[PDB]
Design a binder for this molecule. Structure first.
Ligand SMILES: Nc1ncnc2c1ncn2[C@@H]1O[C@H](COP(=O)(O)OP(=O)(O)NP(=O)(O)O)[C@@H](O)[C@H]1O
Ligand SMILES: Nc1ncnc2c1ncn2[C@@H]1O[C@H](COP(=O)(O)OP(=O)(O)NP(=O)(O)O)[C@@H](O)[C@H]1O
Ligand SMILES: Nc1ncnc2c1ncn2[C@@H]1O[C@H](COP(=O)(O)OP(=O)(O)NP(=O)(O)O)[C@@H](O)[C@H]1O
Ligand SMILES: [Mg+2]
Ligand SMILES: [Mg+2]
Ligand SMILES: [Mg+2]
Lengths: 464, 458, 458
C-alpha cells in the first residue's frame, strides 16, 4: 500500500516523505529505487497547512472557513530512518532515494523475515502490524539493559522474557526488590530465600563483607586464619556429629569471637549486627537452590539496603565462580547457563557509590559471556547507572524516556543507538519499546506483550 | 465552548492554537478530529498584531489610530501540550491534529473522570475549572517532594495534605523546623518533644554521636562493651544521673572514651532523656504527629531527626518480618527545610536515613516527603527517588534543570512553565495523579504559626 | 569516465560535485585543472529536487506527476575531500579547483601506485575499485588500533592480518579472549596454554600478585628475601609441591607473608606451573601464536597477559643490548577485548605493560595491537600512541570524538563518515598507508570459533 512519496533532500540513512495516508512512529516502510530495496522506519510525523500556517493571525477568517466544507488544505510529513537494503544482504543503502520515490507499507513477509526468524524468545509484536518479534537467545550473553520511566513496563518485560525463556528450557535468576515476581502466578517459578552461608564463602569474600581490604595484611591474616579455622572446625564437628543444627549460628558467633585484633573484632561484631537477619549456616549453597528451566526468583522483599547488597553480590560471585569451574572440569559447578536479573539497579550500580554488587555486576559484564552467565539490569534512572556497566550492556530494551539528559546518557553508553532513534523515546507509550542490540537483527520498535499472569503490587496500603 | 482552532504545525504531543477567547496556563482543552478526542494543556500564551508589530517605529501613527475605534488587529496564540486520547483508552494521540481543528474547553465531567476518581486525598482544584484534584494515597509510598521558591506555599501544601490524610485515618510525622505546626489549630494534632533516649540507641548510633568510629579502634571497643553492658543492666532492672554514673564507672583509652562521653552529655543535654519513651509509642495513628525542632541546634536536630527516622524504618521493617513487633501502621515522614539536612557537600546523619527510607520505605509502608526552596542543594540520589513531585513557582532555570534531571516523569515544556506559576499554584507529577496536573492548591483553613521572629524586641 | 563537475565553493582540501553517475563514500576521483592532478575522496552524498523540495505540501500534485513519464528533475551532490596532487609529488593541492572542473573516476593504475607499492601486507581492496590495499609491515612498530562497533569485523581483520604476516615470516602473539583463534583452521597456528611460572618472575611481579607492596614494608622484605633465596636454589639445581614447601619453609610478619602466599597458590592454582617453559621459548617465528584465555578469570587473565607482555618487552630489550640473549625476532602482540584491560577508571597490570610497549616497543621490535568496541573505555595515553588505526563502523559521535582526539592523523570529515561504514568496511590511517584509505576488508577464508555460547543447554 503506497502511503507516501519521497520529497526534498535524502541521504543514505534518512529521507523525507509526503504522505497521502496517516502514518505514525514505529511504522515500517519500503523504498524501491534502482536495485535498492530500502527498509525505512517512520520516526517523526508532523501536520500543517499552506494556508493556515504558523503566521495565521486572523481568527475570523478561520471561523468563516469552518462554515464551509473541507475548504482547508493540509499536509502530512514524516521523517524516515533508512535501516537497510534488503537486496544487498541487508547492508546500508549505498545510494540515496530519488525525490518522488514511492513509499509503501512494509509487508508481513518482509518484517517477519527480519524480526521473527533469527529469534526464539517472543517479546511481542510490531505496532499496528501482526508481526511477532523474536529475540536471539544466545545474544543474551552480551547482557541487557531494560530502561524506562516509572510505570512504562519494565517489570512486565522481565516477566514475559523470563517465562518464554524458561519455556524454551532456559534458566533465569531474578533478584526481587519489591517482591513482584515472588508472589506472582508466573510459570516455572522457583522461589529462593536470601541466605548468607559462611560455609560456602571464601575468606576473601568474608573479608569484603566485614569491610576488610585484602591488602590490609595484618587484619586479613588474623581474619583468614580464624575464618578457615572455625569453618574447618564446624565442618569436622558436623561430620563427627558434635554440633546440632539447632545451635549452629550462635556457635559460629562465639567460635569466631574466640578465634579472634580490635579492628577485626569491631568489624566482625558489626557484621553480625548488620547482617543478622540473613546469616544461616543451615542453608544450602545457592548453586543447589538454582533450578534449570525454571524462573528462579530471590526475594529481597524484607531486607534492608546493606543486606540486599551482601546477598546479591554473594549469589553473583557464586554463580560466576561455579560456571567457571564447570567450563574447566565439566564434572562440577553450575551445569547450565544462567541469566541474572538485577531489579532497581540504580540502587546497587551508582558510580558515586561503591557497593559489592557493582563489583560483581562488572565482573559478569566482562566475563559472563565466556561462562554462560548473562546479566540484565533494570532501572528508571539511566544516569544513575555506572557508565562502565551501562556501556557493556550490548542489548537494550528502552521504553519511554522523557528526560533528555537520560536519553543522552543512554546514547553515550550505547554503540548501536542513533540520536534520531533516541529522540523519539518520549513519544513511546506504555508497553512500547525501542529494542537494540544483537538480540535483534535491526533496531525494532515493538509493542511488548502483556504478561498473561498478574504481578504483585509494589505500593502498600498507606492508611491501614 | 470553542475557544480556538489549530494553526500551523502540529505533532503527536504539541500543537499551536489561535484563540478567540482569552486563555492561560493550566487550561485544559479537547481536540476532536478523526477518531481522536485529544486532551491538551495550554502552556505558553502570546499576543501580537499584524499592524503594530515589533518593527513599528512611528509613535504619531499609533496615536492617530487611538483616536479611532478598534482600528487595530490583534491576535492571541497559545501552545498546547497534547496529553492523551480519551477515545483510545487515554493513550498518546497517535496522529497530529489537522490545521483548523476546533479547540473546546474540556468539560467538568471529563476532567473529574481523570483527576478525581483515581485519588483519595484532595489537594485543591484545577485552574479556572471547578474540578477537585484527588491524589492517590498509596502512591505516597513512592515518596514525595514539595519544591518551590520562598513563600510560594510549601508549608500550606504540607498543612492541607497532613490534615486530609489524618482525616482518612492516615498517619503523618512532621519534623517542624520553625515550629509552624506545633502550636497551631491543625486537626488531629499530636505534639511530640525532641528527646534522645540512649536505651533505644544502637552501639553504632551512640558511638557516632560521641564521634568515636574508625578514628579510634581501641576506644570503640571499650565504648561498645561499656555501652552494651550498661544498657542491658538498665533495661533488665525495668535514671539520667544513674546512666551517667554507671557509664562513668564501666569505663588512657578509657579516659578518651570518658572525655568524649562527658562532652556528649553536655552538647546534647537539652535532648537526652532516659525517662522518655520510644518514638514508636509516642506516635499516634490517624494523627498529625509533629516534632518541635524550634529550639534545637544543628547537631541536636540532626541527631533527633536521624534517630526517629531510623527507629521508624527499623520498626516498620520488623513488623513486616515478624508482625508481632514494631510499628503496626504505615506512616509518612515529612522533612521541612530539607536543604539543611540533605546537602551534597555535607554529610549528615539525617541524609543517610532519608536516603534509606527513599530506597526501602516503599516496602515497609514508610513514605518520605521533603520540603525545600533550594532544589540544587538537595542530593541527586534522594531527589531522584522522590517519584511524586509537587512543584510550585520556580524562576531560576538552573533550579528547573536540576529538578528536571532528578525526575523521570517531568517534561521540558512543563518545567519551562514553572516560572509562570503563582502562589498556591503547582505542577503535580507522579503516581499520585493519572496525568500531569496544573493545580490551584487550597488555602489551609487553619492557622500556622509565623516563621519570621521580631528582629527588634521590646 | 566523467562522473561529475565541480560546482560552488572549493578550497585546497574540499570541493562540491554535481554528479551524472551514482557515487558513494570511498570512491576516489581525479580533478585535472591547470597543472594540478588532484586526487579526491567522495564522502557525503545527497540527492534532491528543484521541483519536489522540502516544502512540497500537495500530495495530489505529486500523484499527478507520477502518471506521467520522468517529469521530475533530480540532482545528486557529493562532497569531495581533496587528498593530494599527483602531478606535484603527491603534496596538497596548492590551489582550489575551478567551478566546472570535470571529475573522473581514478584509474586502477593510479590507485595501485599509491596503495599497493609502499605496502607488504594485504588487508583487502578499495570500495568499488579493483585495487588491493597493502599495509607497510615495518610501520606496525608504531602500533595499531582496530576499533569498531560490535560485529563490524574486528576479529576478521585480526585473523586476516595475522595470517598474511605469518606467511611472510612475521610473528604474532594473540591473547585470545573468547577462544576464537585457538581451535580454528587458521594457518601457521601455534597454540599456547596460559601458564604462570614463578621461576621467570621478578620479586616486584611476584610481590604484586601476593598483594604485598607499600602496604607492608616488613612483609615485603621477608617475602623478597625468601622468594629470591628459594628461586635461586631451584634454578641452581637445574616441582610445584617442592616450590610450595620450600617457600613455606623459608618463611607474626612471616605468617602474614605465608597467609597471602597460600592464598596466592589457591587463586591462581589453575595457572601456576613451574614445569612450564618461559613464554620466549614457546613462541615460534613465522607462526600465529595464540594464548587461550578462554577459561580464565579476570585476575588470572590479567596476571598472564601482563607477565607475557613484560617478558616479551624485556627479552627484546636484552636482545638489542646484548644480542646473545633474549627474543631473537620481532613480534606483534595482539590484545583482543582491550577495553577490559585498558580502562582508565581501573588500574590493571596489563595496562601498565601495554603502555610500556606503546612507548618503548618501537625501539625493540615489539608491536602492539589493541582490539575493542568501547573506544572511550580505552586509556588516552595508550590509544594516542596507536599511530596506526583501522576504524570500522562507529555511529556514536562521542566515540568518534574520542578516537579523533586520540589520533594526530585523523580528519574531522573522515571521522564524520565513520557512521556510513558497513560490516567489513574501514577507514585506515597511519604509516601503514601512504594516504587515508577507505577499504573493503577481505573476509577471512578460514573459520573462527563462535563467541556466543548456548544460553539454554541440553
Ligand atoms: N506491554 C504492556 N502492555 C500493556 N500494559 C503494560 C505493558 N507493560 C506494562 N504495562 C502496564 O503498565 C503499568 C506499569 O507496570 P510495570 O510493568 O511494573 O512497569 P514498571 O516500569 O516496572 N513500573 P515501575 O517499576 O514502578 O517504574 C502496569 O499497569 C502494567 O500492567
Ligand atoms: N494555596 C494558597 N492560596 C493562597 N494563599 C496561599 C496558598 N498557599 C500559601 N498561601 C499564602 O502565601 C504565603 C506563603 O506562605 P507559605 O505557605 O508558608 O509558603 P512557604 O513557601 O512555605 N514560605 P517559606 O517556607 O518560608 O519558603 C502565606 O501568607 C500563605 O498563607
Ligand atoms: N570483511 C568482511 N566481509 C564480510 N563479512 C565480514 C567481514 N568481516 C567480518 N564479517 C562477518 O561479520 C560478522 C561480524 O563478526 P566479527 O568479524 O567477529 O566482528 P566483531 O566486531 O569482531 N564481533 P565482536 O568482536 O563481538 O564485536 C561475522 O559473521 C563475520 O564473519
Ligand atoms: Mg518494576
Ligand atoms: Mg514554609
Ligand atoms: Mg571479535
Amino acid at each position: 500500500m503506497i502511503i507516501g512519496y519521497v520529497i526534498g533532500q535524502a541521504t543514505t540513512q534518512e529521507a523525507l516523505i509526503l504522505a497521502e495516508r496517516p502514518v505514525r512512529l514505529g511504522t515500517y516502510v519500503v523504498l524501491e529505487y534502482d536495485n535498492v530495496k530500502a527498509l525505512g522506519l517512520i520516526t517523526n510525523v508532523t501536520r500543517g497547512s499552506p494556508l493556515l500556517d504558523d503566521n495565521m493571525n486572523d481568527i475570523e477568517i478561520v471561523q468563516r472557513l469552518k462554515q464551509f466544507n473541507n475548504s482547508i488544505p493540509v499536509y502530512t510529513k514524516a521523517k524516515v530512518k533508512l535501516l537497510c537494503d534488503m537486496n544487498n544482504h541487508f547492508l546500508m543503502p549505498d545510494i540515496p532515494p530519488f525525490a518522488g520515490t514511492p513509499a509503501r507499507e512494509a509487508e508481513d513477509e518482509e518484517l517477519k523475515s527480519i524480526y521473527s526468524q533469527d529469534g526464539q524468545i517472543r517479546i511481542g509484536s510490531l505496532i499496528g502490524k501482526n508481526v511477532e518479534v523474536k529475540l536471539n537467545i544466545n545474544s543474551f550473553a552480551r547482557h541487557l539493559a531494560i530502561l524506562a520511566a516509572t510505570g512504562s513496563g519494565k517489570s512486565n518485560t522481565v516477566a514475559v522474557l523470563s517465562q518464554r525463556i524458561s519455556e524454551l528450557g532456559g534458566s533465569v535468576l531474578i533478584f526481587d526488590y519489591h517482591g513482584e515476581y515472588y508472589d506472582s502466578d508466573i510459570k516455572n517459578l522457583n522461589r529462593i530465600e536470601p541466605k548468607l552461608n559462611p560455609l560456602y564463602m571464601t575468606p576473601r569474600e568474608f573479608s569484603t563483607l566485614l569491610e576488610i581490604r585484602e591488602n590490609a595484611i595484618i587484619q586479613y591474616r588474623i581474619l583468614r586464619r580464624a575464618f578457615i579455622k572455625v569453618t574447618n572446625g564446624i565442618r569436622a564437628a558436623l561430620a563427627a556429629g558434635q554440633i546440632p543444627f539447632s545451635t549452629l549460628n550462635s556457635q559460629f558467633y562465639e567460635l569466631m569471637a574466640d578465634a579472634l585484633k580490635d579492628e577485626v573484632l569491631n568489624k566482625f561484631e558489626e557484621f553480625m549486627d548488620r547482617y543478622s537477619n540473613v546469616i544461616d549456616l543451615t542453608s544450602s549453597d545457592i548453586i543447589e537452590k538454582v533450578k534449570r528451566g525454571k524462573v528462579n526468583v530471590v526475594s529481597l522483599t524484607q531486607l534492608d539496603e546493606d543486606s540486599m547488597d551482601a546477598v546479591v553480590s554473594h549469589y553473583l560471585r557464586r554463580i560466576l565462580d561455579s560456571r567457571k569451574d564447570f567450563k574447566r572440569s565439566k564434572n562440577s559447578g553450575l551445569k547450565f547457563p544462567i541469566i541474572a536479573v538485577i531489579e532497581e539497579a540504580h540502587v546497587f550500580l551508582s558510580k558515586n557509590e561503591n557497593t559489592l554488587t557493582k563489583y560483581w555486576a562488572s565482573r559478569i559484564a566482562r566475563e559472563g559471556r565466556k561462562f554462560g552467565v548473562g546479566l540484565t539490569i533494570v532501572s528508571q534512572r539511566p544516569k544513575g547507572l555506572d557508565e562502565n556497566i551501562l556501556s557493556q550492556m550490548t542489548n537494550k530494551i528502552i521504553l519511554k524516556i522523557i528526560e533528555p539528559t537520560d536519553k543522552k546518557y543512554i546514547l553515550e553508553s550505547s554503540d548501536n543507538l542513533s540520536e534520531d532513534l533516541a529522540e523519539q523515546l518520549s513519544s513511546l507509550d506504555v508497553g512500547e519499546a525501542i529494542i537494540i542490540g544483537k538480540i535483534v537483527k535491526l533496531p525494532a520498535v515493538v509493542k511488548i506483550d502483556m504478561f498473561e499472569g498478574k504481578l504483585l503490587g509494589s505500593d502498600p496500603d498507606m492508611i491501614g
